């Protein structure tokens, strides 16, 4: 609360912010409403 009502919505950075190394921190889940992920473009050939 910098302006006593602050917290303007901080979003993900374009480049790196979605971290492939996070997730639910308990064996069970809550099945959050909205989720984000990373994926390539078809230009890069697919490899295992």
């Amino acid at each position: 609360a910098t302006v006593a009502g602050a917290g303007k919505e901080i979003f993900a950075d374009k480049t790196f912010q979605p971290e492939p190394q996070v997730g639910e921190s308990q064996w069970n889940e809550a099945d959050a409403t909205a989720a984000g992920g990373r994926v390539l473009k078809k230009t890069t050939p697919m490899k295992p």
Partner: protein
């Protein structure tokens, strides 16, 4: 009814295992506390030189 459970209480504890992960700082078990985690404690080898 097709199930009969039995309600009992014991003075259980943990003598050699610490908690790897805890959901929240509060005790008084809630639903989230269903999924905590624990890790065994390091070995110790006291003896004579």
């Amino acid at each position: 009814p097709t199930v009969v459970l039995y309600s009992e209480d014991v003075n259980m504890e943990t003598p050699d295992t610490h908690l790897s992960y805890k959901p929240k700082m509060g005790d008084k078990n809630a639903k989230v506390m269903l999924g905590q985690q624990a890790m065994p404690n390091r070995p110790n080898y006291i003896a004579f030189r």
